[PDB]
Curated annotation (Swiss-Prot):
Quaternary structure (record): Binds to the N-terminal domain of the chaperone ClpA.
GO biological process: protein catabolic process; proteolysis
Upper taxonomic lineage: Bacteria, Pseudomonadati, Pseudomonadota, Alphaproteobacteria, Hyphomicrobiales
Highest taxon of source: Bacteria
Portion of the full sequence shown: 20 to 102 of 103
Protein name: ATP-dependent Clp protease adapter protein ClpS 2
Length: 83
């Protein structure tokens, strides 16, 4: 029985709010609306659960989404943690 992993969106003071949104759309197939809501959830409370899936997939999507911010000169960070 594989363990499932939460992909966590973390907060920072630098990454633009709308950039986080379009990342969430592109990588996690969220709409504009859901993207804003999740993005703001991290914005206020420090973090937010984006998705929960198999480990290897969680790691892949966390890396992709983080690399988008990274190569843009942003500290945007997606992590995985187990449940
Ligand atoms: N520009 C800002 O004010 C950031 N707090 C926006 C942001 C929200 C959520 C995040 O996971 C990351 C960044």
């Amino acid at each position: 029985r594989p363990k499932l992993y939460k992909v966590m969106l973390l907060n920072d003071d630098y990454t633009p709010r709308e950039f986080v949104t379009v990342v969430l759309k592109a990588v996690f197939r969220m709409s504009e609306d859901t993207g804003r809501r999740v993005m703001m959830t991290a914005h206020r409370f420090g973090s937010a659960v984006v998705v929960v899936c198999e480990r290897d997939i969680a790691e892949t999507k966390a890396k992709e989404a983080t690399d988008l911010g990274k190569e843009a000169g942003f500290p945007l960070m997606f992590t995985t943690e187990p449940e």
